[PDB]
Amino acid sequence: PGGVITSDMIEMIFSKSPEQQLSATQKFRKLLSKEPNPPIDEVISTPGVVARFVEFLKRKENCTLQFESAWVLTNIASGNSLQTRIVIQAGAVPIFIELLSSEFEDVQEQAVWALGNIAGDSTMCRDYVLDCNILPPLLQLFSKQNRLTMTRNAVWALSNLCRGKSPPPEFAKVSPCLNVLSWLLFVSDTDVLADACWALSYLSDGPNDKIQAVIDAGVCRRLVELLMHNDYKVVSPALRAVGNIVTGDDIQTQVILNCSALQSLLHLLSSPKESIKKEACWTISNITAGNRAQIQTVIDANIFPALISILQTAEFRTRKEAAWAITNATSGGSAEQIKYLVELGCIKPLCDLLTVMDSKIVQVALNGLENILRLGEQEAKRNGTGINPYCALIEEAYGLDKIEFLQSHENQEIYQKAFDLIEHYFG
């Protein structure tokens, strides 16, 4: 040390002989295949050695050597940014791209691998790889539905192109993949479906026109159907994508609802997996922040008893989302609709939230209780009686205590709200 890579490896790598070049390359490749810690730093630190591999990519008469070399560079291009920058600076990218078109399958595959690593390193590496025109010849690769490892690599690499919100890729540079992507949803392989959902979630993760674009490739129905997939690998990203699409306006969200998503979301509300329940709650909250009919479609899917049961039984991350789901409904609902929520028993679970640390949740819960008190006030005048039906009910859930306790809470808006509510609705 140094010399934990052969003196002879340098000698062979740099020789005239193709056999020795390959032999050394193989040693490199196996050492970089090492699970615990591969010698990335040592390799990068012998100064013409990367460049040599990059030149070996150019050897169109040699399948093996091209392949092993792409493998070596694939691994250096794994893990960190500083080791990846060396591969970029030796100009490996245009070469790998040109290698997307090689007559060799193995080379084609490994090259898409390495490019996936490089694009997945950072934002500027991502755009740098788009700028070198990876898309056309990458997309071209799906046109042979025969080979699986290649298709996995490609969607995988592709989701790296779409990934990253800071800044997002230039949409126009990335939105050409929507076709391939929509129809890869009908394929059978778990990994392929998973990455195509990742990719579709990254692309739906933005403003309404980007969502529109995802909607127009018609993936919604597949995406909603994949919520029922047996493998979590597929369900999470699909859940994200559907989750992202429903951040749009009411029309865009309607498209998801027209695919009968709610019935699947309800199912997901019982997932063993907490992140799934959490994500399904959040998706629901964005549906119950829509118009009266959407709220009502959530009522009729029987979603609300599961949300309430979630508020009572689940992790605080999860319950936050259920809580938003319920208060949004009280905010956009008809009187009959809020009566339904009260009759279900949403009052106590809101009142229990009032004493948690997260101030927003407290606000959320107060917002919903306000909304309910407001409808009840509106009722005391339609009917004869001048008593608010929800006053006694909020008191009975120890909600009244919590709200007074909240007058001495440190937060300004909290104490104020609690004060105005006591004054407006309690005696």
Partner: peptide, 16 residues
């Protein structure tokens, strides 16, 4: 409204 929410590790080494 919009938003845990984390992702797969972006890089993958070829092993074995």
């Amino acid at each position: 409204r919009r938003r845990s929410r984390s992702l797969p590790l972006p890089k993958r080494p070829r092993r074995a």
